[PDB]
Design a protein around this ligand. Structure first.
Ligand SMILES: COc1cc(O)cc(O)c1
Ligand SMILES: COc1cc(O)cc(O)c1
Lengths: 208, 208
């Protein structure tokens, strides 16, 4: 069972704008996703301050970056709070409709695409580099789900039956043919060092 | 009934460091508090996407800045999610103990105090300019509480019986004798324009 959903009109337009604007500084996608992981990691850590069983699904709070050159995927895995099915449908937990409005109007008064994360919609920067994004998520209060979209106005949700993760979110980037520099160790390292050097959780860059 | 609580040791040390370091760029306090308001405003907006009665305690989502020259207070009011009593005691909803560790170690490898908000503890920047900070908060799931601290290792909590706010958080800054420029309209305007120009909620600077 796969369910198919329409993007709200504003989200579809933000994704078209991300896909269609000439904008060379694409590397900021990784900063945004890490920062989103970091936020999710903060949330489960906060919950666990008063209830240490929240961490029964996994005690370690970390971020992994996994390139795969065969598959043409870069995967960002965190062991954060995860997302419920309701959260995934509701724009991966964001206030994306208002965030898009704030971002469209910032881009009128002198903003560029790099500032997307100031508007709460930094997830969608995945579409700077990826043709398809698959989200695998597990929250304590729910089952494991996969969200998927190649943009074009719709996303799918299904329950994920394969590889149990325990708790957190994996963002799989199926990269565009011309964006494979983001699979090279050197380049991922440089970007993580540039933009994500003060993240409060260990980031492990896997090797192939 | 006033209860008195000890700051966790790490928080007490961060507050001593905020109070005691020579550091001229104090104005960043306002950016941090607005941004904290903005986060709180995002949260009640998200909740209301699936349950519009969350906004029964007030429909408008905004930030007010209220200087008072008589009282020597600058007040930041939002109509965000608010905070429960448990949230206030637990470091005003932050992961402050780990955030302090990440921030102390950033300040070893080339960071300055302006980057406090990258570590989730930007609230405590209030102590750059204030000798006492009073937090009035109301969350839907709880009563109105006042938190207060002049630093020095302890904070108080009491239920607030005066001026019902409905929902949100008011941060009252009782300013240091030498920090009154932050009560001048011109100066608050300049700072809000410098650092908080892309906030997605209206910010109203009150006049006296
Ligand atoms: C904004 O939606 C996201 C939630 C997560 O837990 C991780 C992301 O990369 C995006
Ligand atoms: C980090 O604690 C805060 C919570 C709020 O709702 C508002 C703040 O200024 C700080």
């Amino acid at each position: 069972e796969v369910e198919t959903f329409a993007f709200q009109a504003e989200i579809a337009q933000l994704m078209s704008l991300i896909i269609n604007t000439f904008y060379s500084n694409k590397e900021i996608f990784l900063r945004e996703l890490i920062s989103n992981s970091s936020d999710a990691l903060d949330k489960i850590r906060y919950e666990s301050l008063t209830d240490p069983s929240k961490l029964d699904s996994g005690k370690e709070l970390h971020i992994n970056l996994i390139p795969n050159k065969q598959d043409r995927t870069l995967t960002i895995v965190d062991t954060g709070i995860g997302m419920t099915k309701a959260d995934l449908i509701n724009n991966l937990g964001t206030i994306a409709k208002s965030g898009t409005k704030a971002f469209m109007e910032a881009l009128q008064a002198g903003a560029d695409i790099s500032m997307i994360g100031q508007f709460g919609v930094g997830f969608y920067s995945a579409y700077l580099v990826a043709e398809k994004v698959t989200v695998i998520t597990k929250h304590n209060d729910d089952e494991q789900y996969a969200w998927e979209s190649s943009a074009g106005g719709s996303f799918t949700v299904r329950t994920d039956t394969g590889e149990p993760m325990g708790r957190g979110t994996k963002v799989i980037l199926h990269l565009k043919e011309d964006q494979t520099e983001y699979l090279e160790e050197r380049r991922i390292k440089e970007i993580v060092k540039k933009h994500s050097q003060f993240i409060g959780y260990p980031i492990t860059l896997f090797v192939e």
